[PDB]
Symmetry: D2
Subunit: 499 residues, 4 copies
């Protein structure tokens, strides 16, 4: 036989062999006499408006598409559960962590970053690894990537960074001058550029890469004590990457390699899992951390901040309809239940605004009423009403203003955010020169071996060669500031390429 993905229709038919086919209806539920021949005046005559079967079906077809995600457009999804394996209730009172063996349903979407909906899975790019936990205190969206860090440390640069990675506004072509002009002018990118052009730039599908929250978050316990944390979810399938050569072959041979691989793994009962850990940094430690502990271009060294196990993420269920359950999935970093809070990370702060904002546009004002986005293990009760495509009962006749004397929903003071002190001017403070090289040097020298340093420099030179010489020169200077051999290896490869 073929793979289970190929046999989707075959299996759908088999599952139904015991049933008569449904009656074909209009959207309004009126049975259709003939959906293959249009209503005309004679066999060689024009089409009538009173063919409302045609108009009903064609008008829906005309409206099938919604905007793709502004980033991470190309993706795959599955469903399963999170199970607590260890007690971290001393750090977080979040209900999702409440007792060992406690299970919370999850939804997950894996993605590339720059490519549009029709692009190939097996390309050099970060990977999105977004986890929605359907908790009794509402949804917790851990909107992670397959890297602990990012290219920039201020949200104001994010639209510019994404523009530089996508298409030239005139030609609609990928543009290496855009890519390398931005990175060469913004050397904070050196850390994530080094990770991206390493072997992990192209994981072997979604099951063989790690996930990370990337940002510093804040955990609050039942006593109102707070620590800073990082989330790490390590693949139980083990790290595995595709060679540049294999990735380029799969790019045209199977552009949907990651989709197919994840579906087949789950369909054959080979359920992928990840182990969720935290690192914990005290408020005192944050004060003496040698960098900004909220800088998204920095990791917390495992030596000083060991991984503490929490639980297991398991994907054991495929989507039944990809559009309804995956394309319409919305992850909001601002969805955090009590016990989990943001840090001052300037990037995370921007994300608190951007996700719900783009969801209201891409899906619609009432996107949280789409079933996969619904906090279906919490009771939603508030003073919000109306908006387009308003489903369920819109909270019925319940008093719609707060406060009221009519016993409508009440706030719960135990859910109040933890209180941190700040002092300072309202100002745009510069983060451009917050050490761009130190952790990058340790990655290059200590984390990588000789063989992977060589590939790293070939991968960089193989892309950078197409940028103008002034951009090549400025980029090489930044790599030299990490380590003189980093820069000179790339320069040697550029000299060979520039003939």
């Amino acid at each position: 036989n073929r793979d289970p993905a190929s046999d989707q229709m075959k299996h759908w038919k088999e599952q139904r062999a015991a049933q008569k086919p449904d009656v074909l209806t209009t959207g309004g539920g009126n049975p259709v006499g003939d959906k293959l021949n249009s209503l005309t005046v004679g066999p060689r005559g024009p089409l009538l408006v009173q063919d409302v079967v045609f108009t009903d079906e064609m008008a829906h077809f005309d409206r099938e598409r919604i905007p793709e995600r502004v980033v991470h457009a190309k993706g795959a999804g599955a469903f399963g559960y999170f199970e607590v394996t260890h007690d971290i209730t001393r750090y977080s009172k979040a209900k999702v962590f409440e007792h060992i063996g406690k299970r919370t349903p999850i939804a997950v979407r894996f993605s590339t970053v720059a490519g549009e909906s029709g692009s190939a899975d097996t390309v050099r790019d970060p990977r999105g690894f977004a986890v929605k936990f359907y908790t009794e205190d509402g949804n917790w969206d851990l909107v992670g990537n397959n890297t602990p860090i990012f290219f920039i440390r201020d949200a104001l640069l994010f639209p510019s960074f994404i523009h530089s990675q996508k298409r030239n506004p005139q030609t609609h072509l990928k543009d290496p001058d855009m890519v390398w002009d931005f990175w060469s002018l913004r050397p904070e990118s050196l850390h994530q550029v080094s990770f991206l052009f390493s072997d992990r730039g192209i994981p072997d599908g979604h099951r063989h890469m790690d996930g990370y929250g990337s940002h510093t978050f804040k955990l609050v316990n039942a006593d109102g004590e707070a620590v800073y944390c990082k989330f790490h979810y390590k693949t139980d399938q083990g790290i595995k990457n595709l060679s540049v050569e294999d990735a380029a072959r799969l790019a045209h041979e199977d552009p949907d390699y990651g989709l197919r691989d994840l579906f087949n793994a789950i369909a054959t009962g080979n359920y992928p899992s990840w182990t969720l850990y935290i690192q914990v940094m005290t408020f005192s430690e944050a004060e003496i951390f040698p960098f900004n502990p909220f800088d998204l271009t920095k990791v917390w060294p495992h030596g000083d901040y060991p991984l503490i196990p929490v639980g297991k993420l398991v994907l054991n269920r495929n989507p039944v309809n990809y559009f309804a359950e995956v394309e319409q999935l919305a992850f909001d970093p601002s969805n955090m239940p009590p016990g989990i809070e943001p840090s001052p990370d300037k990037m995370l702060q921007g994300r608190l605004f951007a996700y719900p904002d783009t969801h209201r546009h891409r899906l619609g004002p009432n996107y949280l009423q789409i079933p996969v986005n619904c906090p279906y293990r919490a009771r939603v009760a508030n003073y919000q009403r109306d908006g387009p495509m308003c489903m369920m009962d819109n909270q019925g006749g319940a008093p719609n203003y707060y406060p009221n004397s009519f016993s409508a929903p009440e706030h719960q003071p135990s859910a109040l955010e933890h209180r941190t002190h700040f002092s300072g001017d309202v100002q745009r403070f510069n983060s451009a020169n917050d050490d761009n090289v130190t952790q990058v040097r340790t990655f290059y020298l200590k984390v990588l071996n000789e063989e992977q340093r060589k590939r790293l420099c070939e991968n960089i030179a193989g892309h950078l060669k197409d940028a103008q010489l002034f951009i090549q020169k400025k980029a090489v200077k930044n790599f030299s500031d990490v380590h003189p051999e980093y820069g000179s290896r790339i320069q040697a490869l550029l000299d060979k390429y520039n003939e």
Copy 2:
């Protein structure tokens, strides 16, 4: 005590008196600690982006409004049932008429025409009387008015007519020159203008007016024989109208008089009902009818085409949430189950397009998935997929192309439309001169008495007086063509006014 409408919240609280208030949440289901004070840095400090309670609630508030209906914006709704009382199965095989005693859930919306969402109920205007039948063969929308006729008999004049009835595009004021310029240039309007300015121009709320399909429709029986029909649903509460003086007082005293009256009637168990009748005209009779039987400016005389009783419409349930159940209600004349079809009425033919079209704009592509619009007593099964705000399962993994060898839904040949012959050139046939006066003379002389003729002429003159003299002159000439006394009575009143 006050009326039941006034005691809505009082009763909501009483119905719950044994229960504590629910927990106030974000749209994401996260409990909120304090929904009355914003998150700031210090008590006189700036508002933080990390106040996602504020942004979640304010962003939904910012999105509450949808476009109002392009016409019939101001309305009231209720629900109940249709019950078959007589057997008309010899005319129509429609399952809604299948056996005496058969009950089908209905939704009804009543409305004015020209006024926007904040306008007054008790003004001179036609009234919408739209009935949605949720049948096993899907929804049947009988999109009726409180008049058997309309001002025009071609859909191409509809936008112009509504423009003329609306606001001046520069001043945003009601414009008597626009109203009377259009009516004076389009004398087919004389019949409905006569009805509009009669006593029934301002019914005493919604319970005291008749409903009509207005259009000729087609009924098809189990043998594939067809007749033409009209739908009449006469108020069991009796015709009652408001005087111009009472209407003007209620306009400012209670702009929502019709809303309040319908809600209080149902809340006190005084359920309003209507008796549904048809008139039947054979294809042969349509050939010799002395007018175009599909001309919306013409009635079928009761003498020649007697009312045949069918059943009862009863409204026994108030909306629980007006936005979700009434503002979002969508009636499509194109929603007709087998046994009911359109006639060639040029106006009805235009309506087959316009309603689903405006609904996809006003509500969204997936507006048939809004609960009140959903054909919840039929099984929707087809090859339509996706679109924004896709709810349900989007028909799961079902094969999405027709035809297919995988047992997805099949067309049902018994639902094929009745097949009519027409012969003629495809062209734009002029209908402007299809007798604009004969049935209007009968209305003026036989349907009205002396007292009603006097008020009719005072009502017309009272509005027409504000139009330019050239428009007055040519409106009066049209009334003179109906009957010399019709014109001269109006001219006498205009002379007094133009004093």
Copy 3:
């Protein structure tokens, strides 16, 4: 003759008498042969889809409506200029104030608050008085009201307040229980409630009321020195109000009284004007102001903070198309040029978010490209691209990422915000008990005389009478806390009303 508003079409025709009528076209510019008769198969046959004249026109008709404003839906607009008369360059470096005699084009929209698009102009409610200044440093939107204060002092209460003032979510009726339950539970409302139920609750059209910024704002001069300020624009036509009785008569006689009065004033050359003043409070004075100087329920007494004259607002031009130039007008309090900045006022801080947010929904992502919203006296140049209904050239082939080495637009350090210092915990500071009565007592005792105190209490009692006794009791107690006679006068009137 009639008023100039009535003669809109008459004047349009006369102005063109020297010209031939334009050729009637489809939206695509195709000339139309007959736009009065639909394309059918025979004179009594069905409508063809190849009637693309019908579909083109009907589809546009079906999409005419956009969401009305969530508040201030009912309005009137006009255009003119702002002229500097006095030098305030020692307080603000804003180019709009740069030299005496300097003129800046303005757009203004006047509005009620609670009523929808079809509601009456002459009702008790605050009035919007929004001014757009098209400056060389971009648009400055001074989104003011006819009151220096508001009902609440934290934006989290705004959606609840507006809900309380609009329709019951079940009945769709105005609901005195909702209005007075909210106000009685939120006594910070006493100051603006007292103003609202005074004579100024119903101004005689838009030309006879004052405008105010309401909020404290910040002014910054060329030396980087800052002061706090209030904006006052006082009617040069003088304060004039409508009696409750006259307002109720105009409500049904001319629901568009304000629209008509403004249009006719400008059309006859009777151009209304306002004098713009500031009050100035130093950072030192802000420290010792006996209340929160950023509390929207408080005024700055004229005795301590005198009005300083700035210039004149003149409206000398009527809209030509109301939908394009008034309905689509978008005012954003966040539109402030260099020299004008927000204060920490919690209400103003919320408004910085809400207006552009609601505009992106009501109008569309590219609403700043609508001509009346366009900053047409500034050069818009940035790294923003695309979005629906993208006009002009979308900034052509300009580099779309910042920073860049390709000479695309550059930030300008002179435009950097003034540096204010804040210190404190991040928390939800309760402002509910920030003195609700002291300035209200001064209003009741000093600003009103005996005759005005009597009407005030009759106006309040006449509405509050319809609320439940427990709500009446709680509301009266709040009025008693202002002054024992305030409460007892209202209670005496309620006793008479409650029979």
Copy 4:
């Protein structure tokens, strides 16, 4: 040096040398002091709502995307002119054809069919070749393909056909069972399937393929006489195709090969051109044509219906902004000036509805006001008003109802559509069995040579091999019905593949 496309930013910068960079502004035109650092309280403090620079830019970024085209998503565009070279005045009075030498501006978009926005250019698929003519009689959209025929001949099958060619609704994978189940059940597809799997299935970019109107159209001359026509626009660059092997290499090496090739051709002055021809069939010839002359699965043999030259299409101008000028381009087959009309082709009749319908969704109600879509060589004048994102003046104060006595636009009777007679029952006439094989046999035996018959069958077998055996069997039977050797050659290749 590099190709002109690579040097887009280099050239933009060079063209601006000797100008200072523009000032970076918000969308409201306010200059920005620093767009690289967010506004916080202290350097490691929280993000403020008062950072309206961040919100203005981020909210626009969040709204960049619009729905991609439901088909033909992946495309390239350019601009130029149409020049009349021959006189066809005797067939069509259309102004665009009026005089030899006469030039009309055009816009063109080339595309694949099934692939999404990020898919590869060099894949086996039909190609779109859409031409917009900006004529004095409004826009003429000739919405063609690189084939004279299509897979189906009734619009009711079009959504199903497209579904079958796109992604499995559960797995989101291309599905050979869906592709071949549809084609095997619908043998009318054989003609276009044979063309698709021939060498012309993968043209060498957009300059080396033909365009066709595909449909029969109607031409009407100044005497009101009509003929039927086909449009052919043949490449002046000559037919050139990519081998399967080269196409697969470019698919990963340059997914935007077609984009780059077109841009570089125009940028270097190598302007591509096509010769526009018509075929003419009289109404008499249409009566005796051996097939349905309106059947989209059939051609008119050149022998019986010779190509008559009309003019030249020349592309001499690249887009300056791809999103504004190409992504936003909207072609409506219903955009036809007088002298050009639809035929009764059931497929064309469907397209008259579908294009403006999907445009109102994808772009918005007022999409004809987007500059590239605007009929800028006609004066648009009608009774249409308002809608979202209304630009220009919305036709100012012009009377907005027809007819009127106020000199607003008038219909032009010379533009009336030509009147055709049709007779028959209004019914759903089955076209499924209208000869599926005869023209396919001629293509297979006479048009192709031995070498290309071999590749045709290898290309088909190479894809068909992945469908289930029952689908392979049914598809081969249809190929056998064309010609026994067609079927048996494919069967032999399937046997080798199926091992």
